[PDB]
């Protein structure tokens, strides 16, 4: 009938530390946790990753924020399970998403 499936919640995928940092944000819509971020080329603020600008990934959002928020706290290191990161809809190929964060400390498992 109504079997509530109690599952865990492990965004982490490796024993690597998940270091955080605070940076200004200029988001234009609601953004839940574990959303990729990119650095704006014009204003150099932090916005939601479009999923098309290759190599623009800068980090992963940690605490949900909105357009009214001025500073966002985002992850800058560690490994995240591929099924828990809320990729933007514009990214339609798994390979590009997997290697999008290469170069920084962020990795996808």
């Amino acid at each position: 009938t109504s079997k509530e499936t109690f599952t865990h919640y492990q965004p982490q995928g490796n024993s690597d530390p998940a270091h955080t940092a605070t940076a200004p944000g200029g988001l234009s819509a609601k953004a839940p946790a574990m959303t990729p971020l990119m650095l704006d080329t014009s204003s150099r603020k932090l916005v939601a990753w479009d999923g098309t600008t290759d190599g623009a990934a800068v980090g992963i959002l940690a605490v949900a924020a909105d357009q009214t928020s001025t500073t966002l706290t985002f992850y800058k290191s560690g490994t995240f399970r591929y099924e828990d990161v809320l990729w933007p809809e514009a990214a339609s190929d798994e390979t590009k998403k997997r290697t999008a964060f290469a170069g920084t400390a962020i990795s996808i498992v």
Partner: protein, 49 residues
């Protein structure tokens, strides 16, 4: 303050404080008085006659 930070995204640390010092050295005073060795032969306003 320590406003909200949740036990997943622990962040900023605090600073120790201090930084004041002043020195106020010398001070001095000495009010010397006389003994009047020849005033004792008379009688004082005390010492009823």
């Amino acid at each position: 303050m320590a406003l909200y930070v949740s036990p997943i995204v622990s962040g900023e640390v605090i600073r120790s404080r201090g930084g004041s010092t002043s020195e106020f050295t010398p001070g001095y005073v000495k009010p010397k008085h006389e003994v009047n060795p020849q005033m004792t032969l008379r009688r004082l306003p005390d010492e009823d006659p």
